[PDB]
Paper text:
FadRSa, of which we show that it displays structural similarities with bacterial TetR-like FadR regulators, is an archaeal member of the widespread prokaryotic TetR family. Each subunit displays two functional domains: an N-terminal helix-turn-helix (HTH) DNA-binding domain (α1–α3) and a C-terminal domain (α4–α9) of which α8 and α9 stabilize dimerization. The finding that FadRSa represses the Saci_1103-Saci_1126 gene cluster and that it is responsive to acyl-CoA molecules acting as inducers in vitro strongly suggests that intracellularly present acyl-CoA molecules cause a derepression and thus higher transcriptional expression of the gene cluster in vivo.
Next, we prepared FadRSa crystals in the presence of lauroyl–CoA (C12:0-CoA) and solved the FadRSa–lauroyl–CoA cocrystal structure to a resolution of 1.90 Å. In contrast to the initial structure showing an acyl-CoA derivative bound to only one of the subunits, in this structure, both subunits of the dimer harbor a lauroyl–CoA molecule. The orientation of the ligand-binding pockets within the protein and the binding mode of the ligand is completely different in FadRSa as compared to the characterized bacterial FadR proteins. In contrast to the ligand entering the pocket from within the dimer interface as in bacterial FadR regulators, in the FadRSa structure the ligand enters the protein from the outer surface of the protein completely opposite to the dimer interface. Further, for each ligand-binding pocket only a single FadRSa subunit is involved in ligand interaction in contrast to two subunits in the bacterial FadR regulators. The lauroyl chain is deeply buried into a tunnel-like binding pocket formed in between helices α4–α7 and is entirely surrounded by hydrophobic residues such as Phe68, Phe97, Phe111, and Phe126. Alanine substitution of the CoA-interacting residues Arg73 and Arg86 confirmed their importance for the ligand response. Subtle differences were noted in the relative orientation of the HTH motifs within a dimer with the binding of lauroyl–CoA causing the distance between the two α3 helices to be enlarged from an average 37.0–43.2 Å (measured as the Cα–Cα distance of Tyr51 residues located in α3). As a consequence, the increased distance between the α3 helices makes the dimeric FadRSa conformation suboptimal for interaction in consecutive major groove segments. Besides the α3 helix, the α2 helix is shifted by an average distance of 7.9 Å and the α4 helix is displaced with an angle of 9°.
Numbering used by the authors:
A (entry chain A): 14 to 196
B (entry chain B): 13 to 195
Write the structure that this text describes.
């Protein structure tokens, strides 16, 4: 019943936004007793916390699937980035949830990026130690790479459904290699 | 001047209480102007978000140009401008809530802000590419990569903490930029 509440919430919030979606809509669409909502969630905004945790987990597994079978950390970045943009395109209906989280639950919005950065920092520190990538604060470098991904996702996937041309995809690979390769 | 009092009052109130809780009565009282005047300048409350975002865009871009006008090397414009952005973002930090709620309440002006910035950015970058200063790639895509970095770094190092970047991190960021952009 918890899971049904969660799945119903995701579809409704993505559709109508947060403020328009009542607990009633959610429990109605989920097909559970209205009372159970309040047991699992003191306030309506507490639902966002578990939603963003699931998205964070799914996005990371998705990307990990494509990055764990790869050689160069520089390949990891190039492929990882490409795959994030594909992922964002598959999940573009849901981006409204993330926008709403930044308004109504800023702590979980921060959590999402900080959790992603924590995972990313480890991987980049290992490549630094091999001499594979530029030796710099690896948290800082994670935010640089995440910031790039987020903004391209907005411009080329959310605000346009063009995606990137082949020429832009080659330019972006060149940007990333040039940034990361020790001179 | 009435218009300027209304705008200043709105900025302060929206930053403090959010957009939904700020009434036109609050705005015009804080402003010290006749209530009905608001409706002469703005059809709706939402229309004053558009004007606020325009003013912040102009003023951010004026501030940065001020530091970057004096530098011939585009590589230096990018290092310095990034630093100056973090300083501006620190100074205007309490206002960032306005931008967050603009994404929900006026998404066309939120997008406009980034598109306008990239428009100005794109011109400066293709100039540098011509002279062989920087890597020859799609200059709008490059804009969005650099804007993306700037935005995520402001979030992590200015809005989510008030620590800022260390001196070492600042040099690391300089290197990241120089590495990305130099063929
Ligand atoms: C609101 C919408 C809009 C949301 C829109 C959000 C906008 C995001 C903007 C930023 C975009 C990016 O930067 S995306 C990054 C693009 N670049 C890259 O991907 C290149 C770098 N890649 C990497 O370093 C890595 O691929 C990662 C770090 C990103 C993720 O690796 P990771 O996090 O270490 O992966 P890992 O722990 O191994 O496993 C991931 C999660 O999967 C689960 N998991 C583990 N095993 C299994 C299993 N058998 N079945 C199911 N699930 C499993 C775990 O519970 C774990 O979460 P848990 O329970 O352990 O916590
Ligand atoms: C909501 C809260 C938070 C909002 C939070 C916002 C989040 C931002 C996240 C990303 C931030 C970034 O990437 S900041 C990017 C950081 N990087 C850099 O700065 C490096 C590269 N820098 C540059 O290339 C340039 O410095 C710029 C592009 C960023 C800006 O140059 P520009 O856009 O050409 O500036 P320019 O048009 O010449 O002047 C800007 C405005 O000044 C006005 N202006 C005013 N007074 C004067 C005057 N006396 N003389 C001339 N012009 C004047 C003009 O009308 C013009 O507006 P008008 O004619 O257009 O009306």
């Amino acid at each position: 019943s918890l899971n049904k509440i969660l799945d119903a919430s995701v579809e409704l919030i993505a559709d109508k936004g947060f403020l328009s979606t009542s607990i009633n809509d959610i429990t109605s669409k989920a097909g559970v007793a209205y009372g159970l909502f309040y047991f699992y969630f003191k306030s309506k905004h507490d639902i966002l916390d578990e939603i963003i945790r699931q998205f964070n987990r799914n996005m990371r597994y998705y990307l990990k699937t494509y990055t764990q079978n790869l050689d160069s950390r520089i390949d990891v970045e190039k492929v990882g980035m490409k795959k994030f943009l594909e992922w964002m395109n598959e999940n573009k209906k849901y981006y409204k949830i993330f926008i709403e989280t930044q308004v109504h639950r800023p702590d979980i919005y921060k959590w999402h990026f900080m959790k992603l950065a924590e995972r990313y920092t480890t991987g980049l520190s290992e490549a630094m130690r091999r001499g594979e990538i530029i030796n710099v604060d690896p948290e800082l470098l994670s935010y640089v790479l995440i910031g790039i991904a987020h903004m391209l996702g907005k411009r080329y996937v959310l605000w346009s459904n063009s995606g990137l041309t082949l020429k832009q995809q080659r330019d972006l690979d060149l940007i990333i290699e040039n940034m990361l390769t020790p001179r």
